[PDB]
Design a protein around this ligand. Sequence first.
Ligand SMILES: *[C@@H]1O[C@H](COC2O[C@@H](C)[C@@H](O)[C@@H](O)[C@@H]2O)[C@@H](O[C@@H]2O[C@H](CO)[C@@H](O[C@@H]3O[C@H](CO[C@H]4O[C@H](CO)[C@@H](O)[C@H](O)[C@@H]4O)[C@@H](O)[C@H](O[C@@H]4O[C@H](CO)[C@@H](O)[C@H](O)[C@@H]4O)[C@@H]3O)[C@H](O)[C@H]2NC(C)=O)[C@H](O)[C@H]1NC(C)=O
Ligand SMILES: *[C@@H]1O[C@H](COC2O[C@@H](C)[C@@H](O)[C@@H](O)[C@@H]2O)[C@@H](O[C@@H]2O[C@H](CO)[C@@H](O[C@@H]3O[C@H](CO[C@H]4O[C@H](CO)[C@@H](O)[C@H](O)[C@@H]4O)[C@@H](O)[C@H](O[C@@H]4O[C@H](CO)[C@@H](O)[C@H](O)[C@@H]4O)[C@@H]3O)[C@H](O)[C@H]2NC(C)=O)[C@H](O)[C@H]1NC(C)=O
Ligand SMILES: *[C@@H]1O[C@H](COC2O[C@@H](C)[C@@H](O)[C@@H](O)[C@@H]2O)[C@@H](O[C@@H]2O[C@H](CO)[C@@H](O[C@@H]3O[C@H](CO[C@H]4O[C@H](CO)[C@@H](O)[C@H](O)[C@@H]4O)[C@@H](O)[C@H](O[C@@H]4O[C@H](CO)[C@@H](O)[C@H](O)[C@@H]4O)[C@@H]3O)[C@H](O)[C@H]2NC(C)=O)[C@H](O)[C@H]1NC(C)=O
Ligand SMILES: CC(=O)N[C@@H]1[C@@H](O)[C@H](O[C@@H]2O[C@H](CO[C@]3(C(=O)O)C[C@H](O)[C@@H](NC(C)=O)[C@H]([C@H](O)[C@H](O)CO)O3)[C@H](O)[C@H](O)[C@H]2O)[C@@H](CO)O[C@H]1O
Ligand SMILES: CC(=O)N[C@@H]1[C@@H](O)[C@H](O[C@@H]2O[C@H](CO[C@]3(C(=O)O)C[C@H](O)[C@@H](NC(C)=O)[C@H]([C@H](O)[C@H](O)CO)O3)[C@H](O)[C@H](O)[C@H]2O)[C@@H](CO)O[C@H]1O
Ligand SMILES: CC(=O)N[C@@H]1[C@@H](O)[C@H](O[C@@H]2O[C@H](CO[C@]3(C(=O)O)C[C@H](O)[C@@H](NC(C)=O)[C@H]([C@H](O)[C@H](O)CO)O3)[C@H](O)[C@H](O)[C@H]2O)[C@@H](CO)O[C@H]1O
Ligand SMILES: *[C@@H]1O[C@H](CO)[C@@H](O)[C@H](O)[C@H]1NC(C)=O
Ligand SMILES: *[C@@H]1O[C@H](CO)[C@@H](O)[C@H](O)[C@H]1NC(C)=O
Ligand SMILES: *[C@@H]1O[C@H](CO)[C@@H](O)[C@H](O)[C@H]1NC(C)=O
Ligand SMILES: *[C@@H]1O[C@H](CO)[C@@H](O)[C@H](O)[C@H]1NC(C)=O
Ligand SMILES: *[C@@H]1O[C@H](CO)[C@@H](O)[C@H](O)[C@H]1NC(C)=O
Ligand SMILES: *[C@@H]1O[C@H](CO)[C@@H](O)[C@H](O)[C@H]1NC(C)=O
Lengths: 324, 324, 324, 167, 167, 167
Amino acid sequence: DPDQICIGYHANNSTEQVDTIMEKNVTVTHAQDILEKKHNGKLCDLDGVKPLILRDCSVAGWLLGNPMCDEFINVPEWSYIVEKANPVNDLCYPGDFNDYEELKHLLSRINHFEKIQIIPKSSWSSHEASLGVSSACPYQGKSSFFRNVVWLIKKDSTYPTIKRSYNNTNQEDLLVLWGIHHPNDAAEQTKLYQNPTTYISVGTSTLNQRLVPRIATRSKVKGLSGRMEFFWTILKPNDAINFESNGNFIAPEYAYKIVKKGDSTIMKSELEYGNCNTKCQTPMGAINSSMPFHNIHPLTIGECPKYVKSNRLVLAIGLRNSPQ
Amino acid sequence: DPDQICIGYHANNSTEQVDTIMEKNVTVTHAQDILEKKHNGKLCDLDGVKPLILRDCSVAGWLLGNPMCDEFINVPEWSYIVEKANPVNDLCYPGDFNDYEELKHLLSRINHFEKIQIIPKSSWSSHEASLGVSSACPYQGKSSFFRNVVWLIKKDSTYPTIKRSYNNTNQEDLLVLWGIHHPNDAAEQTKLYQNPTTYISVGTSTLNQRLVPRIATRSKVKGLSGRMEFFWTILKPNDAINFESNGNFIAPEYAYKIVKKGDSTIMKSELEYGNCNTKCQTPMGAINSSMPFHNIHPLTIGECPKYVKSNRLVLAIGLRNSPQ
Amino acid sequence: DPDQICIGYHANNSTEQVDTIMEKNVTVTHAQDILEKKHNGKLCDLDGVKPLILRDCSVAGWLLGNPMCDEFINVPEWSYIVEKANPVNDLCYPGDFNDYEELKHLLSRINHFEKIQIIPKSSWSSHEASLGVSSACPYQGKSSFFRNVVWLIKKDSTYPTIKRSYNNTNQEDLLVLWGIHHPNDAAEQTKLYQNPTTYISVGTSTLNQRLVPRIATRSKVKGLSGRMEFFWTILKPNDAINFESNGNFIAPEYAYKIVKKGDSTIMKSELEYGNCNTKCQTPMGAINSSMPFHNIHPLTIGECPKYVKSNRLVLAIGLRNSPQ
Amino acid sequence: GLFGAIAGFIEGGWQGMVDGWYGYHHSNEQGSGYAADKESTQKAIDGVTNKVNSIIDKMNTQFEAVGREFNNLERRIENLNKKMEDGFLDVWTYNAELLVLMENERTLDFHDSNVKNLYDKVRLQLRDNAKELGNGCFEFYHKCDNECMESVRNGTYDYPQYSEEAR
Amino acid sequence: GLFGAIAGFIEGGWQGMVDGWYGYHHSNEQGSGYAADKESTQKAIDGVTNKVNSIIDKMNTQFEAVGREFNNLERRIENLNKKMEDGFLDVWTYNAELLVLMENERTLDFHDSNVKNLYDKVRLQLRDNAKELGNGCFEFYHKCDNECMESVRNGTYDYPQYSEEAR
Amino acid sequence: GLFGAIAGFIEGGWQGMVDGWYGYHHSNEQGSGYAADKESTQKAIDGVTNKVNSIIDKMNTQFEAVGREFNNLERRIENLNKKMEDGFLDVWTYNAELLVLMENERTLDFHDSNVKNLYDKVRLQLRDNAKELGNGCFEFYHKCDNECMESVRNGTYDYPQYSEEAR
Ligand SMILES: *[C@@H]1O[C@H](COC2O[C@@H](C)[C@@H](O)[C@@H](O)[C@@H]2O)[C@@H](O[C@@H]2O[C@H](CO)[C@@H](O[C@@H]3O[C@H](CO[C@H]4O[C@H](CO)[C@@H](O)[C@H](O)[C@@H]4O)[C@@H](O)[C@H](O[C@@H]4O[C@H](CO)[C@@H](O)[C@H](O)[C@@H]4O)[C@@H]3O)[C@H](O)[C@H]2NC(C)=O)[C@H](O)[C@H]1NC(C)=O
Ligand SMILES: *[C@@H]1O[C@H](COC2O[C@@H](C)[C@@H](O)[C@@H](O)[C@@H]2O)[C@@H](O[C@@H]2O[C@H](CO)[C@@H](O[C@@H]3O[C@H](CO[C@H]4O[C@H](CO)[C@@H](O)[C@H](O)[C@@H]4O)[C@@H](O)[C@H](O[C@@H]4O[C@H](CO)[C@@H](O)[C@H](O)[C@@H]4O)[C@@H]3O)[C@H](O)[C@H]2NC(C)=O)[C@H](O)[C@H]1NC(C)=O
Ligand SMILES: *[C@@H]1O[C@H](COC2O[C@@H](C)[C@@H](O)[C@@H](O)[C@@H]2O)[C@@H](O[C@@H]2O[C@H](CO)[C@@H](O[C@@H]3O[C@H](CO[C@H]4O[C@H](CO)[C@@H](O)[C@H](O)[C@@H]4O)[C@@H](O)[C@H](O[C@@H]4O[C@H](CO)[C@@H](O)[C@H](O)[C@@H]4O)[C@@H]3O)[C@H](O)[C@H]2NC(C)=O)[C@H](O)[C@H]1NC(C)=O
Ligand SMILES: CC(=O)N[C@@H]1[C@@H](O)[C@H](O[C@@H]2O[C@H](CO[C@]3(C(=O)O)C[C@H](O)[C@@H](NC(C)=O)[C@H]([C@H](O)[C@H](O)CO)O3)[C@H](O)[C@H](O)[C@H]2O)[C@@H](CO)O[C@H]1O
Ligand SMILES: CC(=O)N[C@@H]1[C@@H](O)[C@H](O[C@@H]2O[C@H](CO[C@]3(C(=O)O)C[C@H](O)[C@@H](NC(C)=O)[C@H]([C@H](O)[C@H](O)CO)O3)[C@H](O)[C@H](O)[C@H]2O)[C@@H](CO)O[C@H]1O
Ligand SMILES: CC(=O)N[C@@H]1[C@@H](O)[C@H](O[C@@H]2O[C@H](CO[C@]3(C(=O)O)C[C@H](O)[C@@H](NC(C)=O)[C@H]([C@H](O)[C@H](O)CO)O3)[C@H](O)[C@H](O)[C@H]2O)[C@@H](CO)O[C@H]1O
Ligand SMILES: *[C@@H]1O[C@H](CO)[C@@H](O)[C@H](O)[C@H]1NC(C)=O
Ligand SMILES: *[C@@H]1O[C@H](CO)[C@@H](O)[C@H](O)[C@H]1NC(C)=O
Ligand SMILES: *[C@@H]1O[C@H](CO)[C@@H](O)[C@H](O)[C@H]1NC(C)=O
Ligand SMILES: *[C@@H]1O[C@H](CO)[C@@H](O)[C@H](O)[C@H]1NC(C)=O
Ligand SMILES: *[C@@H]1O[C@H](CO)[C@@H](O)[C@H](O)[C@H]1NC(C)=O
Ligand SMILES: *[C@@H]1O[C@H](CO)[C@@H](O)[C@H](O)[C@H]1NC(C)=O
């Protein structure tokens, strides 16, 4: 029988299939998926700075010191903030936070953060500073209030006009918070503050604010028709903030030194910290991948693959292989 | 003559041309365009819920009951709103609508909509409720006003302080509308309302509003230097809205129960309803197509092909065919 | 020796390399880069209308006539505005400009622009019009003020209520600017304006404004705790603007006729005019190119190639060529 | 074209072959005619159909509502929307135009390949029993009647049966 | 496929050739076996690896923070973000799906080319000293022992040495 | 490469052929030299030029004004613009880089095809009157003077005229 030589190619036991532009379900000897589909199921550090995880508090409750929140633990820097979808503890006393979303964005990523006392609670000689409490803000079965600001009321049927300054002698920007109380009617107004017609003026080198309380008949929320409305500014180094008021003033006691480099955002997630590190975080887990595409979640923070609506992206590596 | 067998390919009478990356105007035996260029020239239902078509009224005129508009016909749901580019009948009495664009966006797609009486016009015992009319808002050759709100004025040279509440006992959100009149000067102010210094306070569980009339010397618009300014809120089930005023109050009579699922937008179009159904609507007509691309119009509502700047996207199917 | 004919291909001395999907650094006989990497290093006309180049002034300082700015030279049209990153001369007297970013956007591209006198400085018979000056706004070693508006003060311990109108008898929209002064306290208030409680009302066919001065204890900026706050409107042809005030009024003298066709934006650049023309401007220079991609700068104005993060996009033209 | 057959060594197409994309023409003492290659034609139809359907079906379409809801003092935001809209238009326009150009090249070269492959299948059956003319045709050195012609078309040509008459 | 070899005139692959992608099978009086073509296999591995790495490495990745920071009276801006997000999702989904389809076609046709080219290298060495069977195999007209077989595989087959025995 | 000719069975290019992309080298008793194939060269030039021009001309360019017009309390909107800008940059960067890689592969394979097709045109004219050496060259079994060489290059080679001297 004559001798033969033949040309041919590799086959194996692979049942892996790919699609081509002209033909579906082509069985090949080897293939490779380029879609990332896995995450670790945990909230991690980002490059590798820890997030601020607020458990059951909103950014506002945390900043103002809502007493129903966990006690303030100093975290001097973070990469992103995690809130639950619906934090139970936000504003214990009902009301509003001015420019709240911009403030949250500003605080999303922070390089240095430090709470300091700027106006001692003990320094209010002409006003009552230890009766500013409410059943809406309990601490240990007793009426209390946001811990970082002070609800001042009249003393000896008198509310002298307040003139207070704080000068930022620090080398860092200072986040300062204050508020106004909106009472229910004129009888309540004079009961708390004596003076019927009141204001709060606040000035810096850029801020020129004058607040006045609005009376309205409002629905009771947690038994209260009154409202607190909070405000904030960034006090630059060597600038001074000047408060003036003859009533309704929710004064600062504590403020926060901040150093701001980059920004990130607020992640909504029900997960807890996982003692891990990552380049790409999603609300249901982190991604560790050099793949070009992923299908896990759109609300990512970090350096992530491109998000696609796909179950698989499989590249042929090897050759057409007879199927089983 | 020796026998022959030959290999060859199909040709036909096609003059259809395509372009390739290396060569233009290649004649082929068969081709297929993948660009959608056709529409039906009509405004249609979307999946398949009818749009709200406002003919010659703005959303504001429709909501407030501008008398120059067509009488209110109940449409309990819709998929998108159609306005003309420049609706002739908007605010008959000159003025403004607060947060108007957000309200229009909210109303763009509605699952349930129902007008109800919340404060009977007949219930204003201490004020005049049937003289709030203007030549700017005619109905049948006689001065009238927005039909869904009431322009109250003094009675017997008296405007008693109003204290009114409505409680949302319904199971649906309620859209509530009110206004303030801004008179021309103090002499006009006291002529209409008796009291020289007036307010309108409005409170819900979230709203804490106090309006005051601004006097200005303004240009006459339709003979009038006065202005109406309208406001709105979403009153949740079991919440109450509380009005207080000693003048200038444009009170609600009717409000609207709403159920909100998705959103869409406001389409600007001069077309009328075409008794049709579609997945993709444009202002000049609807598209019924599974093609990947279209070139009809960018302002589409629905599930549409991708919009491109192209006159044709023709794929070769068959073979190179000799041209004519 | 038998005769031979051979088939072959061109080679040359090219060392140009390209990359292919399957192989890097393939030497070829000829190649072509499709990435634009060059600019002319100059700020140019755009199609071919000159930009407005503000040198060391902000748009606000330029509009209001900050005296520290260069004298106003009429430029009747422009394609885009160029500011330095940090213009030294902005608001000489400290304060704020309302809706400033929207105004800058509106003024970014202008088809006609013409400064006109609308209220002669000499027409203020009942008020002092030549003492409205400050050390913060010097001109030639002497206290002055924004040149296009007038800081009115009391005369003979009297500030009569102002009632002034300007009617736009021109055929073009008119940009009108005014301001309010916010003094430091009531003693200063009465010193300048006599009247302790003051307002500024401004009305057009659309505008219905009432400003009141806010007192605050503010930080000294350039020695001054006072503030100026500026406002603006577009007065349509045949409409009238009506001012009323009993103090704190920074009145218009000059306004600007404008014709608006397209928009562009504000370019931030430290370059000067280069007496050139272009279709595509960047802050570091103009691009003259029909190439599809460029890598120069993202903040372009005009009809530009697509911006990419790439150092080279080299297409093979010729054939595989043996390397050196 | 890439494979050298269509409008290449096979210089033109056949109006006379109506029932397929690729096939054969025979001429012998019994007559002449065209026969489609059913298998290659059907595979090619399936192939091109799949390509077109993939271009169509792989597009993700979702509900969107495109309007103009910003006011006269929201022009900076309206410009942000303009840049986005124009940006996506430029992306889809470029990608659609090039896709069509590139896939049309692939389709025409695919047909060319299919014809070349059919040619080669015949060439290797016939080998030395016919002359390769260079124009897509083979000139037999033996008589090849209709049954013989069908054997070539159905890939069962018996070379040893004719080698003697061919030489 | 495009080049006519893989699942074409070479009808199926070889489970028996485990140490390469393309190669040879010989049969003579001394026995039979498979030998991988090392050079073509390695070049192909490098080629496909480069393609995959380019698809991966050419992607520009940058830091972004994607959340939902607009409130209940900022729904028009929130819709602008929706349209943008959905728009980029549609772009990347389409481009990724088609890229995979198109590159898979290229990869399979590349292997086919590689096999065809190996076949032709052998064909031109052997010329008239072996019969081309049409199935990827050549039937020698002379004895070709193991050293002879290796000469064919390493591209040094000496045609003049055997032409006499072949004729 | 895909078609097996360039840097394949034709192992290298010719510095000596300056006036075209593809062509012929002849050697006979009268001398030797290079001649460009004008037709294939021009068609290839037109083809590649068209590809480059399509990549350039199919781009839709429109006026845009890109600045930074949002203030310190509009950072959420400014971030929306960032995500959009960065998004389009990532799209164009990826698509441009891959386009270049993919089209460069097509261009090099196109040249390879063009050379293979020229080779085959000659092969089929010469058939049995010359030996196919396997390196791109044909060795004549008859004398082929300059006029004969030109007949091959212009596709009018007369096989019957020389078959007797070749055998
Ligand atoms: C926020 O805080 C800044 C720093 O405040 C401080 O400095 C002083 C005032 C103390 O209060 C100290 O405890 C605190 O750290 C502040 O600034 C200061 O602003 C002052 C405003 O007047 C200014 O005071 C003047 O200082 C002059 C001397 O200046 C020279 O010496 C300084 C010390 O070496 C030096 O820093 C300066 O650069 C300079 O070389 C005095 O001659 C002035 O004269 C007096 O003025 C008083 C009224 O203003 C009168 O009572 C006196 O009769 C006399 O006429 C005056 O004291 C101080 O110099 C500033 N310091 C710096 C470093 O700038 C800043 O203003 C605050 N920010 C606000 C309010 O927005
Ligand atoms: C909007 O509307 C909500 C429903 O209003 C209605 O309920 C009552 C008040 C009628 O007006 C009725 O026509 C209407 O549909 C409203 O809510 C109600 O808010 C009331 C506020 O006080 C509250 O009234 C109290 O009810 C107690 C009994 O509660 C028990 O019984 C109810 C009936 O079965 C039941 O719904 C409750 O869950 C509960 O089991 C009384 O004992 C209270 O005592 C009186 O208080 C009065 C003053 O507040 C005094 O006049 C009396 O001396 C006595 O002390 C009181 O009447 C009512 O229970 C709430 N109902 C529900 C279902 O929640 C809601 O507040 C309104 N929203 C606003 C204002 O924002
Ligand atoms: C801004 O400016 C617009 C034009 O103003 C001007 O017209 C007049 C008033 C002069 O001031 C002149 O210098 C200036 O260019 C302005 O408009 C005008 O608005 C006026 C408001 O009343 C109006 O005046 C009335 O004109 C009637 C005549 O109208 C007829 O004749 C006109 C001239 O040919 C013509 O333009 C008109 O179309 C029409 O055919 C008078 O009969 C009116 O009667 C008087 O009313 C007075 C009080 O209003 C009484 O004092 C008299 O006793 C009498 O009863 C009246 O004078 C004028 O016609 C309008 N002109 C135009 C072209 O529209 C516009 O209102 C200003 N914009 C504002 C304020 O927002
Ligand atoms: C000090 C005190 O007990 N005063 C009595 C009022 O509380 C009481 O009115 C009732 O007030 C209820 C809420 O009570 C608080 C609260 O929020 O918990 C009690 C706080 O001590 C008080 N705090 C301060 C700093 O004054 C707080 C505050 O006044 C309001 O929140 C301000 O808006 O109120 C609840 O609202 C009931 O509806 C209301 O009846 C009256 C009873 O007539 O007597 C007061 O002496
Ligand atoms: C009731 C009445 O007729 N009063 C006389 C005034 O109308 C009149 O002043 C003129 O007012 C003109 C507009 O008239 C109306 C209107 O808008 O149609 C008439 C309406 O009845 C009145 N409605 C109510 C509820 O009061 C309405 C209203 O007062 C204003 O719109 C409020 O801003 O005015 C027009 O503006 C003329 O310019 C003006 O002269 C004076 C004449 O001096 O006498 C009044 O008794
Ligand atoms: C007219 C005059 O010189 N008045 C004396 C005050 O100037 C002086 O108070 C000092 O004021 C300082 C700033 O001075 C000006 C300025 O801005 O340059 C001087 C201007 O002439 C004046 N302009 C006008 C139109 O009144 C201007 C203006 O009043 C304020 O800017 C309004 O806010 O002030 C500086 O602020 C010093 O801190 C302050 O002491 C007092 C001295 O007690 O005497 C006045 O007669
Ligand atoms: C397929 O072949 C590989 C390589 O020999 C082997 O490791 C694997 O277990 C096989 N799969 C089976 C036996 O299912
Ligand atoms: C390809 O495979 C999937 C199952 O994995 C099947 O549902 C689909 O119909 C197949 N398509 C074809 C054309 O065989
Ligand atoms: C082209 O050929 C088709 C198929 O026979 C025929 O139906 C059509 O009418 C022809 N076109 C003409 C005659 O113009
Ligand atoms: C292709 O066809 C169009 C007419 O449909 C013509 O304008 C264009 O110039 C043609 N291009 C070429 C290269 O023939
Ligand atoms: C390469 O060849 C070209 C064409 O002859 C010549 O112009 C160029 O100078 C050469 N490059 C050298 C000598 O470096
Ligand atoms: C290709 O060229 C660059 C230098 O221009 C070099 O850094 C890179 O490593 C080269 N890559 C390969 C695979 O040779």
